[PDB]
Amino acid sequence: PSETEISQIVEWIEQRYQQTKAHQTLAAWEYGSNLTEFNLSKKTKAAADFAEVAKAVAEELATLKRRIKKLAKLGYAALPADQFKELLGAIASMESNYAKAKFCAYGDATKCDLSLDPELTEIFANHREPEELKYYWVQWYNATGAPVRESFQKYVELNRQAALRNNFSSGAAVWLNEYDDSTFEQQVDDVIEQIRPLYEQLHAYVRYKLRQKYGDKLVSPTGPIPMHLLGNLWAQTWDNIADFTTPFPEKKLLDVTDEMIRQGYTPIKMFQMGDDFFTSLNMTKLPQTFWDKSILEKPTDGRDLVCHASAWDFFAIDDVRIKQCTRVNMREFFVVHHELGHIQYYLQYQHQPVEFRGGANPGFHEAVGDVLSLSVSTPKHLKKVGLLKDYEEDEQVKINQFYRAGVTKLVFLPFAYTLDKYRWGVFRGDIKPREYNCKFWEMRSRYSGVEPPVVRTEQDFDPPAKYHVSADVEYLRYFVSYVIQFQFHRAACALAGEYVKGDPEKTLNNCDIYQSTAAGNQLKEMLALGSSKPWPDAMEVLTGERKMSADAILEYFDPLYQWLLEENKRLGAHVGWTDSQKCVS
Ligand SMILES: *[C@@H]1O[C@H](CO)[C@@H](O[C@@H]2O[C@H](CO)[C@@H](O[C@@H]3O[C@H](CO)[C@@H](O)[C@H](O)[C@@H]3O)[C@H](O)[C@H]2NC(C)=O)[C@H](O)[C@H]1NC(C)=O
Ligand SMILES: O=C(O)[C@@H]1C[C@@H](C2CCCCC2)CN1C(=O)CP(=O)(O)CCCCc1ccccc1
Ligand SMILES: [Zn+2]
């Protein structure tokens, strides 16, 4: 047979394999927004009904050769139907336990309807009572972590079996194989080192001021930071305390909260301003199928659902939905853009076959939305839209401008790095089950300098307390994002004439790229490829480079770096930390 002959058959397998994706995807959405035993029994069926399809599509099998092997990645479909159900069953048992968790208020046993979103999320983000933050910290982990230890161990062994039947060493080889570059696990390690001098200086700064506020008894000047004081359950972002520990408080903030309240903001209003951005870039306009079938507010009926913001692609055409329990605050506003970046990416490669209907690599997907967040963060873009007015950006302000960006986005790179670095150690057998917990906190202490609020033990199993852990969702994507999103932001700040390496008062940190079609067109082209071309090619269409480069982000925070170096010295603050003793064996 000729080239077209083999291609004439794949297209017949493209659709047949693409329909059961939507069936399995739609059934996954039902259980995603309506946690019911009935919906779980239907999600796993469409999955099993799908695995039967992928299993058969494999044996039945330049662009061509890619498809013949890009459509056969079983994933977990290599296991027998009984083990396939057993794997997804253990996973859902963790995600279910994660989204259904409810808690009793601190000091009130009669009120026991508190949930992660909104109560717990906003308690940590705004309460400055240590004993309270600690109480909710233990309650959250003892409820979402250890109770699913047994289900997790089952999920691991089957994830490893699937990796073997797919011809791989362990689960780690799978997630890494997604980036298709044996020299990538080492690339990441290199970038973290390039970031360590900056993060530690910022870490020391935060710790000292956290010691100012709460006192020395609660914050050791030489030990890791109690993570429950960083305004976030997982300490992945410290934005919720940026104002609480700001360099110069007698300055203008960038909360953009009350001015969202004053101007009567609604969850739908926010998403509109997001659609308003992509359109200005000559990109896709948010369709109506999204306005209808999406969930942009926590349902006030009482069902059980996964409030963890997400964006879905049911394949087919133009059916894009976002499930986010939105609230009125600046933090949520950026969460929207991250989800919209996922929706946009769907609309760009929807004209591709089922194989190439995905981002170049997991990093691109997560990065898209945050790239706009970089421009929105700027006062320039916030000043255009009333949210930000009378903002006399001084030199100090630009420090707070660089500071917030650090405690918000910089501290997240070490966090995202440790997550997958740990799971890889569990898949590769480097972490025995008898030491699951204290090896996790050992990494969190080493690479982020934060420790639990109370002494944990191996009886506890805290990793599942993170959504992505209980849901089996790779997190390195979020790390790669925070590295490439500055490269994209760079090549997008240059095509909008908003960045020239050296530009004094036209900084790469104040680069607002609204109404830039040239940047959009080039962005549309990269997203259009999806998984059609290797990610180096997609990497080049927009950035011009073909490798992940920390030069962008390193240039972003260098102004903050120089102020921390000079400031930590004067403040007489300690840098670095001793090992954490908050986990015993
Ligand atoms: C969350 O999922 C559950 C599934 O366990 C949904 O229950 C289902 O609700 C629909 C109606 O929304 C039921 O269909 C109805 O059947 C009656 C006859 O009994 C018919 O007259 C109605 O026109 C409608 O077709 C369905 O039977 C029911 N399934 C089960 C197993 O109870 C629930 O509605 C979902 N929640 C939300 C908020 O969507
Ligand atoms: O909160 C977190 O932990 C991270 C970081 C944060 C992000 C946006 C705000 C600014 C900081 C970075 C938000 N988020 C997300 O995972 C949101 P998603 O759309 O990727 C959610 C991706 C998971 C999709 C899924 C759902 C069900 C089954 C399988 C897969
Ligand atoms: Zn994402």
XYZ file of C-alpha atoms and ligand atoms in Angstrom:
655
model
C 0.000 0.000 0.000
C 1.032 3.594 -0.719
C 1.274 6.418 1.823
C -2.326 7.565 1.330
C -3.629 3.989 1.615
C -2.330 3.607 5.175
C -3.541 7.166 5.808
C -7.005 6.367 4.431
C -7.436 3.774 7.203
C -6.122 5.826 10.134
C -8.712 8.556 9.549
C -11.334 5.822 9.905
C -9.660 4.962 13.222
C -9.215 8.640 14.161
C -12.940 9.308 14.562
C -13.899 5.918 16.022
C -11.160 6.466 18.618
C -12.152 10.137 19.010
C -15.835 9.491 19.760
C -15.298 7.165 22.726
C -12.909 9.825 24.037
C -15.843 12.244 24.253
C -18.055 9.506 25.705
C -15.402 8.770 28.334
C -14.685 12.494 28.697
C -18.355 13.447 29.051
C -18.909 10.664 31.587
C -15.830 11.929 33.436
C -17.356 15.422 33.542
C -20.642 14.159 35.008
C -18.772 12.657 37.959
C -16.490 15.702 37.996
C -19.343 18.138 38.669
C -21.709 15.685 40.420
C -19.955 13.186 42.706
C -22.399 10.270 42.805
C -21.952 6.513 42.981
C -24.229 6.392 39.931
C -21.942 8.749 38.000
C -18.831 6.850 39.105
C -20.321 3.602 37.784
C -20.869 5.316 34.413
C -17.490 7.063 34.167
C -15.564 3.818 34.658
C -17.796 2.082 32.099
C -17.042 4.573 29.320
C -13.391 4.285 30.349
C -13.559 0.488 30.197
C -15.570 0.795 26.980
C -12.771 3.078 25.786
C -9.878 0.863 26.892
C -11.438 -1.858 24.739
C -11.154 0.579 21.816
C -7.554 1.642 22.459
C -6.503 -1.989 22.934
C -7.887 -2.860 19.490
C -6.676 0.342 17.804
C -3.108 -0.599 18.747
C -2.816 -3.993 17.050
C -4.724 -2.667 14.025
C -1.777 -0.286 13.492
C 6.572 11.954 8.372
C 3.190 12.899 9.822
C 1.929 9.333 9.305
C 4.542 7.434 11.315
C 3.834 9.843 14.174
C 0.116 9.026 14.087
C 0.704 5.262 13.900
C 2.609 5.517 17.201
C 1.034 8.671 18.683
C -2.426 7.030 18.681
C -1.274 3.799 20.366
C -0.003 5.111 23.718
C -2.223 2.859 25.833
C -1.363 4.693 29.043
C -3.310 2.554 31.504
C -5.163 0.635 28.762
C -2.391 -1.993 28.729
C -3.772 -3.616 31.893
C -6.586 -6.187 31.826
C -10.097 -4.828 32.231
C -10.205 -5.996 35.855
C -6.934 -4.250 36.735
C -7.933 -1.224 34.642
C -11.038 -0.718 36.779
C -8.974 -1.448 39.895
C -6.564 1.372 39.021
C -9.157 4.048 38.234
C -11.150 2.876 41.251
C -8.273 3.564 43.633
C -7.689 6.975 42.029
C -11.305 8.131 42.264
C -11.387 6.873 45.858
C -8.675 9.448 46.601
C -10.185 12.296 44.570
C -13.611 11.564 46.062
C -12.124 11.683 49.564
C -10.462 14.975 48.576
C -13.513 16.860 47.274
C -16.087 15.591 49.801
C -14.078 16.568 52.891
C -15.971 18.663 55.443
C -14.773 20.149 58.718
C -15.988 21.715 61.951
C -15.211 25.352 62.694
C -12.401 26.275 65.086
C -14.191 26.659 68.408
C -17.673 25.601 67.248
C -18.587 21.911 67.028
C -22.181 22.641 65.959
C -21.042 24.151 62.633
C -19.513 21.363 60.527
C -20.121 22.362 56.898
C -16.748 23.989 56.176
C -15.042 22.924 52.946
C -11.731 23.549 51.202
C -13.312 26.022 48.799
C -14.244 28.673 50.069
C -13.888 28.549 53.857
C -10.532 26.813 54.355
C -8.999 28.480 51.292
C -9.939 31.911 52.658
C -9.101 31.116 56.296
C -5.434 30.512 55.493
C -5.405 33.372 52.983
C -6.606 35.953 55.536
C -6.518 34.640 59.136
C -3.351 35.464 61.090
C -4.042 33.296 64.153
C -1.372 30.556 64.436
C -3.326 28.117 66.615
C -6.259 28.484 64.210
C -4.187 27.992 61.052
C -2.566 24.982 62.730
C -5.918 23.459 63.709
C -7.224 23.637 60.142
C -3.867 22.416 58.820
C -3.984 19.193 60.846
C -7.700 18.763 60.147
C -7.125 19.079 56.396
C -4.208 16.635 56.224
C -5.518 14.029 58.684
C -8.677 13.956 56.530
C -7.309 14.081 52.960
C -4.016 12.239 53.503
C -3.681 9.144 55.670
C -7.291 7.886 55.168
C -6.409 7.062 51.544
C -3.024 5.425 52.207
C -4.313 1.959 51.294
C -6.040 3.217 48.142
C -2.852 5.043 47.143
C -0.579 2.003 47.453
C -2.985 0.196 45.118
C -2.849 3.095 42.654
C 0.961 3.007 42.658
C 1.425 -0.706 41.961
C -1.031 -0.569 39.051
C 0.485 2.638 37.675
C 3.797 0.764 37.699
C 2.256 -2.281 36.009
C 0.791 -0.032 33.308
C 4.235 1.520 32.839
C 5.749 -1.935 32.309
C 3.085 -3.183 29.885
C 3.715 0.074 27.986
C 7.430 -0.891 27.828
C 8.905 1.528 30.349
C 10.953 1.336 33.534
C 8.493 2.931 35.972
C 5.776 5.559 36.162
C 8.463 8.245 36.268
C 9.702 7.225 32.815
C 6.139 7.753 31.564
C 5.624 11.338 32.744
C 9.147 12.185 31.578
C 8.602 10.416 28.247
C 5.886 13.020 27.626
C 8.567 15.691 27.122
C 10.554 13.434 24.749
C 14.036 14.451 25.855
C 16.290 12.156 27.897
C 18.147 15.354 28.850
C 15.169 16.950 30.578
C 15.167 15.485 34.092
C 18.636 17.047 34.278
C 17.541 20.324 32.657
C 15.006 20.832 35.449
C 17.611 20.136 38.134
C 19.820 22.798 36.542
C 17.103 25.471 36.480
C 16.295 24.892 40.159
C 19.934 25.593 41.030
C 19.868 28.792 38.964
C 16.819 29.792 41.031
C 18.049 28.702 44.483
C 20.179 31.808 45.255
C 17.124 33.958 44.542
C 14.526 31.877 46.387
C 16.676 31.519 49.505
C 17.221 35.281 49.682
C 13.464 35.755 49.301
C 12.820 32.899 51.746
C 15.061 34.541 54.344
C 13.308 37.878 53.837
C 9.847 36.385 54.358
C 10.970 34.375 57.385
C 12.373 37.411 59.194
C 9.188 39.440 58.730
C 7.041 36.429 59.610
C 9.151 36.381 62.775
C 8.479 40.103 63.253
C 4.714 39.565 63.207
C 4.181 36.270 65.038
C 7.301 36.318 67.230
C 10.383 34.187 67.704
C 8.557 31.418 69.574
C 6.581 30.562 66.423
C 9.225 31.322 63.769
C 12.806 30.145 64.192
C 15.354 32.461 62.512
C 17.439 29.449 61.424
C 14.891 26.679 60.823
C 12.366 26.031 58.057
C 9.253 28.192 57.982
C 6.046 26.717 59.460
C 4.100 26.307 56.226
C 0.743 27.089 57.861
C 1.774 30.763 58.177
C 2.296 31.292 54.423
C -1.363 31.949 53.587
C -1.608 28.681 51.660
C -2.286 25.106 52.744
C 0.610 23.762 50.657
C 2.834 26.886 50.748
C 3.103 26.667 46.950
C 2.322 30.394 46.743
C 2.728 33.016 49.466
C 0.682 35.715 47.719
C -1.924 35.763 50.498
C 0.732 37.224 52.843
C 2.507 39.523 50.366
C 0.795 42.529 51.953
C 1.156 41.060 55.457
C 4.959 41.042 55.025
C 5.513 43.745 52.423
C 8.824 45.662 52.291
C 7.280 49.131 52.636
C 3.649 49.037 53.827
C 3.048 52.805 53.540
C 2.619 52.474 49.781
C -0.053 51.561 47.252
C -1.120 47.924 47.194
C -2.104 45.678 44.307
C -4.912 43.798 46.044
C -7.554 44.676 43.415
C -10.227 43.302 45.758
C -12.516 45.987 47.214
C -12.306 47.711 43.829
C -13.726 44.486 42.426
C -16.396 44.640 45.142
C -17.003 48.385 44.772
C -17.484 47.881 41.026
C -19.779 44.914 41.738
C -17.769 42.133 40.132
C -19.288 38.725 39.451
C -17.680 35.403 38.486
C -19.148 35.716 34.983
C -17.831 39.279 34.659
C -14.277 38.081 35.313
C -14.444 35.351 32.663
C -15.722 37.939 30.175
C -12.638 40.100 30.706
C -10.601 36.964 30.048
C -12.369 36.320 26.753
C -11.866 40.040 26.107
C -8.102 39.438 26.180
C -7.815 36.554 23.708
C -10.059 38.301 21.171
C -7.911 41.448 21.235
C -5.037 39.185 20.132
C -6.993 38.217 16.979
C -7.663 34.793 18.517
C -10.809 32.768 19.202
C -13.857 34.398 20.771
C -15.295 32.462 23.696
C -18.247 30.508 22.207
C -21.699 30.044 23.733
C -21.358 26.304 24.397
C -19.034 27.446 27.192
C -21.436 30.003 28.687
C -24.104 27.279 28.851
C -22.548 23.987 29.975
C -19.826 25.482 32.205
C -19.888 25.936 35.984
C -18.397 29.233 37.183
C -19.839 29.238 40.722
C -19.969 26.727 43.544
C -23.466 25.204 43.171
C -25.611 26.342 46.104
C -27.693 23.134 46.080
C -25.496 20.955 48.315
C -24.217 18.232 45.960
C -20.642 16.930 46.088
C -18.305 18.160 43.357
C -14.624 18.807 42.684
C -14.310 22.557 43.253
C -10.671 22.375 42.120
C -10.708 24.702 39.108
C -10.337 22.903 35.789
C -10.833 23.251 32.039
C -12.190 20.462 29.853
C -12.080 19.378 26.212
C -14.845 16.951 25.248
C -13.282 16.792 21.763
C -15.994 16.989 19.046
C -16.207 20.716 18.145
C -16.295 23.969 20.136
C -17.526 22.238 23.329
C -15.287 23.832 25.970
C -16.182 24.082 29.656
C -14.612 25.385 32.865
C -15.549 24.043 36.311
C -14.334 26.598 38.867
C -15.891 27.514 42.228
C -15.006 31.140 41.595
C -14.925 33.814 44.293
C -14.545 37.597 44.183
C -10.872 38.412 44.758
C -7.682 39.009 42.802
C -6.302 35.528 43.507
C -9.306 33.931 41.804
C -8.997 36.381 38.900
C -5.670 34.857 37.846
C -7.036 31.330 38.310
C -9.527 32.219 35.572
C -6.770 33.099 33.099
C -4.994 29.809 33.794
C -8.192 27.896 33.018
C -8.934 30.062 29.972
C -5.433 29.349 28.679
C -6.410 25.678 28.699
C -9.692 26.392 26.904
C -7.997 28.494 24.219
C -5.472 25.732 23.536
C -8.396 23.403 22.796
C -9.974 25.790 20.283
C -6.669 26.104 18.406
C -5.998 22.406 17.700
C -9.624 21.248 17.509
C -8.983 20.990 13.752
C -6.351 18.309 14.453
C -6.753 14.524 14.647
C -7.284 12.995 18.075
C -3.529 12.465 18.443
C -2.479 16.077 17.838
C -5.373 17.509 19.898
C -3.104 18.408 22.788
C -0.362 20.763 23.830
C 3.182 20.319 22.582
C 4.060 19.139 26.084
C 2.336 19.425 29.474
C 4.259 22.640 30.153
C 2.820 24.591 27.223
C -0.755 23.850 28.304
C -0.386 25.220 31.832
C 1.762 28.124 30.640
C -0.685 29.703 28.174
C -3.045 31.127 30.778
C -0.298 32.307 33.123
C 1.422 34.189 30.284
C -1.550 36.562 30.213
C -1.496 36.715 34.017
C 2.002 38.198 33.714
C 0.603 41.057 31.626
C -2.511 41.464 33.786
C -0.327 41.649 36.900
C 1.189 44.853 35.523
C -0.440 48.119 36.674
C -0.429 49.236 33.033
C -3.112 46.654 32.203
C -4.857 47.051 35.570
C -4.846 50.838 35.151
C -6.657 50.626 31.803
C -9.679 49.016 33.476
C -10.540 51.054 36.560
C -9.554 48.232 38.932
C -6.308 50.161 39.432
C -6.456 53.951 39.691
C -4.368 56.687 41.318
C -1.302 54.408 41.513
C 1.850 56.514 41.946
C 4.352 53.794 41.084
C 7.439 54.955 42.998
C 10.774 53.144 43.144
C 9.596 51.404 46.329
C 6.344 50.452 44.592
C 8.324 48.720 41.849
C 10.009 46.764 44.653
C 6.628 45.684 46.012
C 5.784 45.175 42.335
C 8.768 42.821 42.067
C 8.219 41.491 45.600
C 4.620 40.323 45.144
C 5.693 38.595 41.928
C 8.283 36.701 43.978
C 6.157 35.562 46.914
C 3.450 34.729 44.346
C 5.222 33.008 41.435
C 8.906 32.502 42.311
C 8.343 30.373 45.420
C 6.140 28.107 43.282
C 8.981 26.698 41.161
C 10.641 24.817 44.064
C 7.210 23.575 45.154
C 6.265 22.221 41.721
C 9.729 20.649 41.483
C 9.493 18.626 44.700
C 6.054 17.183 43.892
C 7.038 15.172 40.816
C 10.578 14.648 42.128
C 8.939 12.732 44.990
C 6.387 10.754 42.972
C 9.188 9.681 40.629
C 10.960 8.340 43.714
C 7.884 6.306 44.637
C 7.418 4.913 41.123
C 11.116 4.048 40.741
C 11.150 2.290 44.122
C 13.614 4.825 45.547
C 11.081 5.526 48.336
C 9.944 2.473 50.278
C 6.366 2.484 51.628
C 7.695 2.411 55.205
C 9.197 5.884 54.584
C 6.530 7.528 52.420
C 5.823 10.491 54.702
C 9.137 11.658 56.171
C 10.880 11.499 52.787
C 8.185 13.795 51.374
C 8.594 16.438 54.080
C 12.371 16.006 53.798
C 12.241 17.231 50.195
C 9.763 20.012 50.973
C 12.175 21.179 53.678
C 15.316 20.907 51.541
C 14.111 22.671 48.389
C 11.565 25.097 49.912
C 12.536 25.533 53.574
C 9.022 24.964 54.942
C 7.885 22.393 57.494
C 4.521 21.234 58.863
C 3.094 23.027 61.913
C 3.302 19.880 64.080
C 5.512 16.814 64.324
C 4.262 14.298 61.764
C 4.942 10.559 61.722
C 4.749 7.633 59.316
C 1.277 6.852 60.660
C 0.421 9.993 58.679
C 0.488 10.081 54.868
C 0.280 13.717 53.788
C 1.054 13.708 50.015
C -2.591 13.009 49.076
C -3.552 16.291 50.789
C -2.728 17.913 47.427
C -5.387 17.701 44.723
C -3.046 16.569 41.945
C -1.696 13.747 44.125
C -5.081 12.170 44.858
C -6.033 12.709 41.192
C -2.871 11.285 39.556
C -2.056 14.476 37.649
C 1.549 15.268 36.726
C 2.727 18.513 38.313
C 6.027 19.062 36.475
C 3.846 20.755 33.855
C 3.310 23.567 36.363
C 7.072 23.840 36.883
C 7.972 23.832 33.180
C 5.216 26.426 32.760
C 6.788 28.899 35.199
C 10.024 28.542 33.195
C 8.723 28.731 29.625
C 5.891 31.175 30.380
C 8.611 33.817 30.764
C 10.226 32.778 27.474
C 6.847 33.039 25.747
C 6.168 36.263 27.652
C 9.573 37.388 26.374
C 8.998 36.609 22.691
C 5.486 38.036 23.132
C 6.815 41.196 24.796
C 9.255 41.634 21.891
C 6.722 41.138 19.084
C 4.470 43.724 20.756
C 7.465 46.069 20.919
C 7.360 45.886 24.717
C 10.800 44.424 25.517
C 14.393 45.171 24.484
C 16.995 43.514 26.725
C 18.321 46.579 28.563
C 15.236 48.832 28.224
C 15.510 50.899 31.439
C 12.014 52.213 32.259
C 10.258 49.931 29.762
C 10.967 46.834 31.832
C 10.114 43.232 31.014
C 8.215 43.249 34.326
C 5.868 46.093 33.301
C 5.214 44.643 29.820
C 1.456 44.785 29.213
C 0.559 43.124 25.910
C -3.072 44.059 25.283
C -4.327 44.521 21.713
C -1.267 42.807 20.171
C -2.313 40.819 17.104
C 1.255 40.138 15.945
C 1.977 38.361 19.228
C -1.400 36.637 18.996
C -0.864 35.425 15.435
C 2.503 33.927 16.389
C 0.879 32.482 19.515
C -2.009 31.066 17.473
C 0.555 29.350 15.241
C 2.353 27.648 18.135
C -0.869 26.529 19.822
C -2.178 25.420 16.418
C 0.558 22.779 16.205
C -0.459 21.176 19.486
C 1.136 17.732 19.453
C 1.462 17.741 15.653
C 5.154 18.681 15.788
C 7.781 18.005 18.472
C 7.785 20.695 21.135
C 11.210 22.057 20.080
C 9.649 23.026 16.744
C 6.667 24.569 18.527
C 9.166 26.106 20.952
C 10.827 27.855 17.997
C 7.775 29.045 16.032
C 7.062 31.578 18.797
C 10.202 32.051 20.896
C 12.816 31.367 18.221
C 14.696 29.140 20.669
C 14.486 25.340 20.726
C 15.392 24.615 24.369
C 14.019 25.545 27.773
C 15.901 28.618 29.000
C 15.786 30.087 32.502
C 17.290 33.319 31.134
C 13.827 34.886 30.900
C 12.658 34.328 34.481
C 16.168 34.939 35.830
C 16.031 38.349 34.149
C 12.517 38.941 35.501
C 13.374 38.889 39.213
C 16.979 40.130 39.040
C 15.810 43.564 40.305
C 14.254 41.847 43.324
C 17.389 39.712 43.680
C 19.589 42.792 44.057
C 17.275 44.390 46.620
C 17.104 41.187 48.669
C 20.883 40.708 48.658
C 21.421 44.289 49.814
C 18.439 44.192 52.189
C 19.080 40.832 53.867
C 22.612 41.978 54.712
C 21.399 45.174 56.383
C 18.378 43.623 58.117
C 20.840 41.166 59.659
C 18.761 38.153 58.660
C 19.897 34.557 58.336
C 19.791 32.882 54.924
C 19.296 29.162 54.445
C 17.890 26.736 56.977
C 18.674 23.697 59.077
C 17.037 20.384 58.253
C 13.449 20.024 59.422
C 12.725 17.925 62.509
C 8.941 17.844 61.969
C 8.882 14.175 60.911
C 10.052 11.271 63.076
C 10.574 7.584 62.321
C -26.343 13.932 40.039
O -26.378 12.571 39.569
C -27.560 11.847 39.931
C -27.351 10.414 39.507
O -27.195 9.566 40.637
C -28.757 12.507 39.266
O -29.942 11.771 39.555
C -30.758 11.686 38.362
O -31.596 12.843 38.231
C -32.391 12.843 37.036
C -33.123 14.163 37.000
O -32.231 15.258 37.159
C -33.330 11.640 37.031
O -34.038 11.616 35.797
C -35.427 11.960 35.998
O -36.230 10.789 36.080
C -37.627 11.048 36.304
C -38.321 9.713 36.522
O -37.821 9.141 37.724
C -38.176 11.821 35.094
O -39.553 12.102 35.294
C -37.395 13.129 34.914
O -37.876 13.830 33.768
C -35.888 12.873 34.828
O -35.656 12.247 33.575
C -32.537 10.350 37.200
O -33.428 9.249 37.342
C -31.628 10.427 38.426
N -30.808 9.230 38.528
C -30.659 8.537 39.663
C -29.777 7.328 39.583
O -31.209 8.872 40.707
C -28.864 13.937 39.774
O -29.945 14.600 39.131
C -27.566 14.703 39.503
N -27.631 16.030 40.096
C -27.703 17.157 39.379
C -27.768 18.433 40.166
O -27.716 17.148 38.152
O -3.831 25.347 42.593
C -2.992 24.547 42.063
O -2.551 23.630 42.705
C -2.545 24.740 40.628
C -1.798 25.892 40.472
C -2.804 27.034 40.110
C -2.317 27.813 38.954
C -3.372 28.869 38.536
C -3.432 30.094 39.452
C -2.072 30.758 39.539
C -1.048 29.757 40.091
C -0.967 28.481 39.240
C -4.134 26.258 39.806
N -3.791 24.965 39.692
C -4.462 23.933 38.824
O -4.059 22.813 38.809
C -5.698 24.326 37.941
P -5.727 23.324 36.404
O -6.574 24.049 35.310
O -4.344 23.124 35.927
C -6.482 21.676 36.807
C -5.857 20.510 35.924
C -6.512 19.104 36.246
C -7.520 18.668 35.173
C -8.176 17.249 35.505
C -9.405 17.184 36.173
C -9.976 15.939 36.465
C -9.334 14.784 36.096
C -8.095 14.848 35.423
C -7.525 16.079 35.133
Zn -3.360 24.043 34.215
